[PDB]
Structure 1
Amino acid sequence: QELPQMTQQLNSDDMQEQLSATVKFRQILSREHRPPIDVVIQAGVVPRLVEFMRENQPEMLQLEAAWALTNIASGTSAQTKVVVDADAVPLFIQLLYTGSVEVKEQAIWALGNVAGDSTDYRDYVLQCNAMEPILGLFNSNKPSLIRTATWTLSNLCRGKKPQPDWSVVSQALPTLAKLIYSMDTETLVDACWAISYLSDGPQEAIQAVIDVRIPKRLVELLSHESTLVQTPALRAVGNIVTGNDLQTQVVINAGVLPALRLLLSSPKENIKKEACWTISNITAGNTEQIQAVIDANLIPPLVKLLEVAEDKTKKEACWAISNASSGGLQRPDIIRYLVSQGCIKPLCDLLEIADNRIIEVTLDALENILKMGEADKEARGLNINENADFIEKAGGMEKIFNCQQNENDKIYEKAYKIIETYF
């Protein structure tokens, strides 16, 4: 259409024509569905647009050109590659330092799409030292800019395989710690995602998150009126409790248990699922933390979900109760408590799920219950294992016996031993 003329105008030496042309390119690219990215790329104007972002170029030109490149980078890795190979990244970064506010708003968005393309482009942007100028944007007192920068910042932290350069992304913790206190929902959401990414890693990363005192706030955000905030905050909390017993205790001390208790009755199924997931990693802790969960009255509602929640959630509830049962070896009463709360019936019923990882998890729990029951019997001269009688009455014996027919050897081995040992 105008593209042929637009291309010629863009390469013109007249600046009025360059700007008119750049704006048209920005306009045709501003489409959410099926943007004319390839047509613009093939017009061969990317290097020219990148050229308009140079430091001494007219402001409007830098602005429109960066905006256009921003949307080209919003495409596939192939289309994004064109922008990157044209050396646009280092220019986006410099614009973050010298550009007018409007210009910076384009540049940071562009960096957001580039870093969000893949681990390599994420690393590339980090290698170009984008972190420093980016963290600087949070002192702008500019909402729109901060929102985009928070998002961009999260893409720089995102990715577990490969994990981003920790020595660089860790630099953003102090900033993220303050951002989760923002009243702007949009910024808060992205800050929480960023944090969940940084929290998703080695012991030192979780510890760095704990050291800046982020957990206290994450727990409070679990009750934020929007699930858009609850989801990431809960994710960050969950990732943190995948840490050691000490790190996990910090989260417990920040009062996560009562909060999780409320999440167990959330209207959103994924919230209930992740709340159980989070509890499962706490009951995977030491004796005291398993007891803390017990004292926080999480078992009853956990048992309820185990019996009536959607499968994905039930599986998570199963992990929690099962990890908790592993503590009975050190404290039998934990098993007595679990059984008194009716975990046996739901656990057995779950033996028929189409997930072997869960069958194993359930068989282990039932065995932890069987062992305690056996020890109690041995302890006080009885000849009947009370918990074995409970399992049989719950129809669990028949189900366990059937797991022996599972093609999975591990399942088979577990079921067999349980049957021959307690039944």
Structure 2
Amino acid sequence: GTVNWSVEDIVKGINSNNLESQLQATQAARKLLSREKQPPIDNIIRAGLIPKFVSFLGKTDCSPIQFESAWALTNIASGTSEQTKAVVDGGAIPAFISLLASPHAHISEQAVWALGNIAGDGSAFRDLVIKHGAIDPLLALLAVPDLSTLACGYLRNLTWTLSNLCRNKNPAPPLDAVEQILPTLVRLLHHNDPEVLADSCWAISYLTDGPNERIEMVVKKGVVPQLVKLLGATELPIVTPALRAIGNIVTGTDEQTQKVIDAGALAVFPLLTNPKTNIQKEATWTMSNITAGRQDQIQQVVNHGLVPFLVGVLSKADFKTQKEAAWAITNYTSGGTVEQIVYLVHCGIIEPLMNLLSAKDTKIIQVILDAISNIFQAAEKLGETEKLSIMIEECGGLDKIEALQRHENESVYKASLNLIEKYFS
């Protein structure tokens, strides 16, 4: 019936002044735009059809044509920025926001989806959707005692659209927008649908990606324990944004980092052996921002047995993960006590550390040499530089620190030098 029309035929029927004729052409349009292979987005734009689709959104007494046009505009806006811009320039934003009030759940769902595709283009379209007043009627759709009485697919669409309103920096979303969305967002973060949880953690991870005062708005709402719970999900599409959000919060103040520790987060990090390389990476990254904190927080790292896990990740891991581990160690050795640094050496940090001095990356080597000297400072404070110096010797670390005098980078070669003449003379 409406299967593969030409864009010429669609134009003829939409330009008829026959609402039923237009309904059929609009659906032929939607079917074109929703095929797997190369939907003709540009052909439809160039045919001039976008303003007619937007106008069809208003046709209250023909909800089928509202539905078809909304579907069609959704898919045009799912494309390139210029394609999405074509939909906005057609006046679709006030029109989709009106549709949020539809009595038909499949219409409003399609309205939700398109606003998501528009807000996803970036900060300006995001902010522009908010300025047109999308938030109030979006949250209204979720004003029910129990989310569980809403349709599954309907719920996941809203959550996704709500994360895109939380997304992108330069600038971050309006603060009042964030405060208006955050409570409902906390409610989705406790819903039991795996896809809703994933999309909510993404949103929370965006909101915590920025200045400490952004992080503070999230921590203030008490979401951290539930982030820690989701940090231990079996479902890796959940673990991934939960970890990113946790990693974001610990870049804040020590008090904010302390609330991650207080919620039990360190118990899940034995993350550091996850089969998925990026989880291992982001977990080590988080660990380096926790060893950068206070001595009592370093001590909490020690007490959870996490130091043997950093030795492990230093010994064998993807090299990007190892580079974070070297950062974690240098931070630990910068802020830790003598006892804590001594503990590090007893756990076997020395050998895996020396072997990465063979790396090409210049920052990892200056980070590693940094760590060594903090560790030699501790050995002096104990009258014990000698024994450590021999450990570095026996496993062939001296060879490395020697050869690092040849290094082109200036901070490198003066670093190794200082080490050899101060403790290897």
- TM bucket by the smaller chain? over 0.9
CA contact (8 A) 2:166 2:178 kept: yes
Q: What does residue 395 of structure 1 align with?
A: 396
Question: Could you state the TM-score of these two structures normalised by the residue count of structure 1?
Answer: 0.94
Cα distance in 2, alignment partners of residues 411 and 120 from structure 1: 44
Structure 2: how far apart are the matches of 1:415 and 1:57? 79
Q: Could you tell me how far apart the structure 1 residues matched to 2:421 and 2:113 are?
A: 63
CA contact (8 A) 1:373 1:388 kept: no
- CA deviations on 1:164-185 (whole Å, 9 max, x unpaired) are 2233123221112121111111
Give 1:2-401 correspondences, 5 Å limit: 2-54=6-58, 56=60, 58-98=62-102, 100-139=104-143, 141-261=150-270, 263-328=271-336, 331-377=337-383, 384-401=385-402
Cα shift at 1:55: 6.0
Residue deviations 1:233-269 (CA, integer Å, cap 9, x gap): 11111111111110111010000001112x2222222
RMSD across aligned C-alpha pairs, in angstroms?
Answer: 1.6
Q: Which moved more, 1:168-177 or 1:70-79?
A: 168-177
* % identical aligned pairs: 48
* Equivalent AA in structure 2 for residue 285 of structure 1: G
Cα distance change of structure 1 residues 396 and 99 upon mapping to structure 2, 3 Å threshold: farther
TM (norm. structure 2) is: 0.93
Structure 1 stretch 386-395 or stretch 223-232: which is displaced more? 386-395
Give the CA deviation at 1:52.
0.7
Mark the CA change 1:136 to 1:419 in structure 2 (over 3 Å): closer, same or farther: farther
Partner in structure 1 of residue 147 of structure 2: none
Quote the Cα distance in structure 2 between the aligned partners of 1:351 and 1:410. Answer: 15
2-side partners of 1:160 and 1:351: how far apart?
37
- Deviation, 1:57, is 5.3
- Asked whether 1:410 is paired with 2:411, we answer yes
After TM superposition, the runs of 4+ consecutive aligned structure 1 residues lying more than 3 A away are none
Residue 404 of structure 1 aligns with an amino acid whose one-letter code is Q
CA distance in structure 2 between the partners assigned to 1:112 and 1:33 by the alignment: 23
Note closer, same or farther for the CA distance 1:240–1:416 as it changes in structure 2 (3 Å cut).
Answer: same
- Tell me how far apart the structure 2 counterparts of residues 250 and 137 of structure 1 sit (CA, whole Å): 33
CA shift, 1:135, in A, is 2.1
AA aligned to 2:335 is G
Could you tell me which amino acid in structure 1 is paired with residue 168 of structure 2?
G
CA positional deviation for 1:81: 1.0
The farther-off stretch of 98-107 and 8-17 is 98-107
Secondary structure in 2 matching 1:319 = helix
Give the C-alpha shift of residue 33 in structure 1. 4.1
TM superposition shift of 1:48: 0.5
CA distance in 1: counterparts of 2:207 and 2:68, whole angstroms: 33
Closer, same or farther: CA 226–421 of 1 in aligned 2, 3 Å: same
Q: Is the contact between residue 97 and residue 133 of structure 1 (CA under 8 Å) also seen in structure 2?
A: yes
Q: Work out whether residues 59 and 65 of structure 2, in 8 Å CA contact, stay in contact via their aligned partners in 1.
A: no
1:137/1:146 contact within 8 Å kept: no
User: Cα offset for 1:403?
Assistant: 2.5
Matching residue's letter, 1:319: W
- Residue 347 of structure 1 aligns with an amino acid whose one-letter code is L
CA deviation after TM superposition for structure 1 residue 152, in Å: 1.1
Q: SS in structure 1 opposite 2:301? A: helix
Q: For 1:52, what is the secondary structure of its paired residue?
A: helix
Secondary structure in structure 2 of the residue aligned to 1:181: coil
- Report the count of equivalent residues: 415
What is the distance in 2 between the residues matched to 1:192 and 1:14? Answer: 47
More moved, 350-359 vs 207-216: 350-359
**C-alpha deviations, 1:349-400, integer Å up to 9, x for none?**
11222322222221111111111112222xxxx6x53222222222222212
Q: Partners in 2 of 1:246 and 1:209 — Cα distance?
A: 13
Task: Report what 2:422 is aligned to.
Answer: 421
Structure 2 CA distance for aligned equivalents of residues 360 and 99 of structure 1? 63
**Other structure's SS at 2:421 match:** helix
| Structure 1 unmatched ranges of 5 or more | none
Give, in angstroms, the shift of residue 157 of structure 1.
1.4
